């Protein structure tokens with residue numbers, strides 16, 4: 216079994232903190248005082264993608280594939296997802312990612328981010344939301360959008376859906392809200408990126424008269440990066456979701472070390488709050504280390520991109536299977552995967568604003584406190 | 586200038602006739618007048634079992650490595666971004682009868698003319714201010730946006746439904762029944778052919794949906810649409826074609842086409858000529874004309890997808906420019922392109938259907954001329 220295991224890193228625009236968390240988590244793997252948990256040296260090479268254009272992406276992936284990495288950590292967006300997942304599946308190279316989980320059932324993709332739709336549907340049912348507005352963009356896929364479409368037909372809900380992903384004019388959010396007032400709409404599910412949630416919420420405040428009596432359910436695991444003090448002042452209910460529990464001592468002890476790190480060597484660790492995607496990045500390194508320690512224990516053997524007679528990687532299958540079978544405790548709770556690399560047996564914490572109102576998991580569904 | 590010019594062929598699922606038309610058109614270029622055939626035209630074909638990005642990239646690059654001077658092929662909504670991206674980065678001209686793209690890209694010659702101008706003209710000519718618009722997204726969003734914009738700005742009552750994902754024929758019935766409750770008699774259907782046939786079968790089976798109804802079928806594959814059962818009930822049907830049967834070039838092509846052996850050229854005897862096989866024929870005319878042009882200008886023409894050194898600014902530019910500047914007569918009328926490889930100065934024939942008369946023609950300057 217090798218002395219060194221090398222992994223790839225594919226990073227996008229605006230993943231600076233995650234890059235830092237990645238470098239730091241690897242360093243924690245390598246400086247562990249316990250020799251049993253560190254039987255090989257963990258090493259890496261990183262590429263940054265200026266864009267998600269298909270050529271740029273393929274070039275980057277193949278340069279790393281050619282170096283001989285044993286797995287690849289990285290990010291995709293709506294534009295690059297299909298290229299990365301397709302090359303990984305064809306070349307048997309496991310891609311570990313904290314990006315949004317895919318719609319399709321693919322091989323060789325470990326999705327660190329749990330799905331939200333189960334929790335969202337449970338809370339729609341628990342709050343009895345049978346008439347509501349659903350503002351969405353497509354940047355985290357279509358998974359939630361379709362679950363909501365299907366449930367609306369099946370339950371006879373009046374959902375007014377509006378696709379806000381392309382709006383560059385903040386005045387146009389106002390025109391949408393004013394329209395929804397004419398229909399008496401007080402309940403809003405907002406399935407957007409964080410920055411767009413903040414934009415939308417600023418318009419709610421500035422426009423005015425849109426707090427007391429209203430309820431915004433924010434379907435995004437980046438709850439703690441959402442600026443929502445101005446909306447709460449008016450009296451609005453807000454429901455949110457998190458997967459990082461701050462009272463968890465593992466998170467606490469990680470944070471303690473994290474905030475001491477130098478601004479040059481590890482940017483966005485002092486000056487910025489910990490994003491949930493940097494927590495998933497930390498947990499990706501736990502999962503990768505655990506899988507390779509497992510392979511060493513099983514005594515499994517491990518060792519050109521655009522070949523026309525493309526030769527499959529023999530050992531890739533064991534690496535995939537090893538990553539999928541890990542059970543580890545991380546900053547995002549219990550971490551396990553099903554056969555399509557999706558998180559299973561996870562917990563989503565539900566926040567009502569500022570108490571934790573309950574938790575959701577796959578078996579119990581939504582359990583409220585009190 | 587070389588003895589042989591080689592081209593690539595990228596074919597997808599359900600392009601068997603087009604593959605035959607491609608092989609046949611090349612053969613007609615090569616067996617011609619010595620002046621119109623100063624080099625031998627040669628090709629290598631790959632088939633894409635799927636439109637997954639690796640399968641597509643591997644196919645494109647294998648052909649790029651052989652040293653082809655252009656690539657003929659197809660894309661779909663899934664593969665468009667991969668192909669247009671690799672074409673632009675490697676300066677390799679992609680000639681295609683697939684749907685024209687939304688974005689303005691380089692190195693892509695789009696044989697299929699746009700429909701939206703013609704559709705909007707006929708909506709205005711028939712005075713359609715209240716109608717249903719059933720659509721899928723497989724030919725791009727060009728038509729969908731034109732209709733959204735025109736509905737706002739003309740004060741139309743358009744009821745739009747996106748039917749691209751429906752695999753349950755029962756669900757088309759629920760949609761039509763809903764539109765009866767609003768008194769809707771006029772339907773614009775912007776779908777693939779097979780889905781148009783599905784939809785139309787439901788119209789018949791459901792029944793009482795012909796006499797006072799009007800279906801405008803926004804799809805150039807008009808002659809593959811099964812519409813006899815709908816017409817018998819008395820429904821008006823409007824359609825569009827770009828292949829004119831009275832054109833002697835089409836007639837003489839058909840004459841030869843239907844005599845071709847079933848083994849060597851499948852789907853030429855047993856199946857009607859699809860408009861995409863006509864565009865495939867015209868692609869070979871365009872390619873031959875461009876390379877004859879380059880030989881006449883005395884332009885020089887002669888590795889690998891990973892750009893270790895990379896593609897210099899000046900490579901493939903002559904070939905791009907040559908393909909874009911051709912003016913030729915083909916099975917689909919006058920063929921010219923603008924700077925983004927889009928058809929310009931084209932004509933669309935409009936058909937009204939017992940009855941089956943050509944009701945008029947549409948072009949960019951005159952708009953719809955009714956006869």
Ligand SMILES: *[C@@H]1O[C@H](CO)[C@@H](O)[C@H](O)[C@H]1NC(C)=O
Nearest residue numbers: 918919920921929930931932
């Ligand atoms: C327009 O196209 C026609 C052929 O259909 C041709 O007679 C004429 O030269 C073209 N004009 C321009 C400006 O391309």
